[PDB]
Amino acid sequence: MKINIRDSTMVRPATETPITNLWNSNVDLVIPRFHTPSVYFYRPTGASNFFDPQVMKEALSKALVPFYPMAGRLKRDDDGRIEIDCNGAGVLFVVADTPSVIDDFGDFAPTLNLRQLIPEVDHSTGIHSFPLLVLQVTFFKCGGASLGVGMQHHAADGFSGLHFINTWSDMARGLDLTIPPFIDRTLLRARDPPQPAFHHVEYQPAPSMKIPLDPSKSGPENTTVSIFKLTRDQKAKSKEDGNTVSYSSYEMLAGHVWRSVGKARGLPNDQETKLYIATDGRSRLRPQLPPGYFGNVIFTATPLAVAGDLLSKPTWYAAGQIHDFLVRMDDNYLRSALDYLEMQPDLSALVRGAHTYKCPNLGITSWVRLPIYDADFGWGRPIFMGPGGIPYEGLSFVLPSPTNDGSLSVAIALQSEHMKLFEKFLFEI
To answer: Contact at 8 Å (CB) between 248 and 187?
Structure first.
């Protein structure tokens, strides 16, 4: 598609913010190097001032006073550890036009051309040379608009990122700050001395294919991205084969996706397959994190199975493996995990910038509980919000319904031929 940039502004906090160096916990360091992409789409109201850039920039500068680290930069301290240089250098805000219309995105499958709706960042020069947050409003021919978001997660995770975007929109509507950000990640400081109590499977290497796969076709350029609606349901039946154990809706769904992906990939009976589940630690850490905690708190649950078992046993078996790993992740385990991380020489080497989400493994994250449609800047809630292009194969997202309409969507990247079979997705037998 064709993007025409009309304006590009570095937006700074509306008033003076603290000049300071913000420490990063171990969880703020096991972080992808690139900016994480997300996109929102809005229908026109028909009003002339729809997404007025002036209103947007003014409210952005305002939100950047309590969320001031967002306007900072990356630096390393004396020990070489990355920290946030809170210098209020600011946030990139781009305005664009395109002859395309929103309806061209059809089902809003998060294809990679979505990246054109988010500003590009050059990571080639230093870590201190790019804003932590880049933003783009693009006006479509149809009168509609997208908001493109690129955020470097050393600043914070997607949950705190949402807190910021929603606050920004509240302010565009002339409203007040509701939950003030809490800015201090020493709450996740590791114990001294570090004392891990577990062997943490979730930091071990992913299983490889016992029999290596044809690099292409089956690489970057054989990867399709699709989205699928599940229309409720359309947890039951976990009663299959007389199983009495009750599993949650999330457990059953994640197990189903994991299993369906295994089936679609034709995994041999003896092939191990690992599932990586984004798990929010805010509700599990037991001194209990302040509301508005600004930072990363996303841990990962990694249940494993042999495909022979995963694919021949009922879906509740998959849900069971998942549940077993989700249940072990209480404060004691997460504290253990922080201590484990503390002893590793190089935290950046533990980042799954995968590579490892490749057949036979899978990542899944659910945004079902997240306030992803609350960003009303004064012209209505978005008709869609999703990841801004799934980078590579083996990543999946569960998205709540914009209308609810208790429907769910599964957005996922797989190899071309695997994707067709993934239509295994649509039978609970």
So the answer is: no
Is 133 part of any known ligand binding site? no
Query: DSSP letters of 112-140?
Result: GGGGGGS-----SS-TTSS-SEEEEEEEE
The residue type at 234: Q
Q: Which two tokens stand for residue 70?
A: 């967002």
DSSP state of 370: S
Whether 347 has a binding-site annotation, put simply, is no
327 DSSP assignment = H
153 catalytically annotated: yes
226 in a known ligand binding site = no
Which residues face 138 on adjacent strands? 96, 146
Q: What's the token pair of residue 161?
A: 């990122």
Give me the catalytic one of 153, 154, 256, 323: 153
In this structure, how many other beta carbons lie within 10 angstroms of the beta carbon of residue 8? 12
CA distance 135 to 120: 10
User: Is 367 one of the annotated binding-site residues?
Assistant: yes
Domains and CATH numbers, the chain: 2-205 (3.30.559.10), 210-429 (3.30.559.10)
The HSE-up count of residue 315 (CA atoms within 13 Å, CB side) is: 28
C-alpha distances out from residue 208 to 212, 298, 350, 355, 394, Å: 8, 25, 17, 10, 13
| Method used to obtain the model | X-ray
Give the whole-angstrom CA distance, residue 37 versus residue 135. Answer: 10
Take residue 287 and report the two structure tokens written for it: 């001194």
384 burial (CB, 10 Å; 0-12 / 13-18 / 19+) is buried
Helix axes 249-264, 315-328, angle to 10 degrees: 120
Q: State yes or no: cis peptide before 212, omega within 30 of 0.
A: no
Using CA atoms, how far apart are residues 367 and 402, in angstroms rounded to an integer?
12
Q: What's this structure's resolution in Å?
A: 2.2
CA dist., res. 208 & res. 220, Å (int): 18
Helix (H, G, I), strand (E, B) or coil at 232: coil
Beta bridge pairs of residue 305: 273
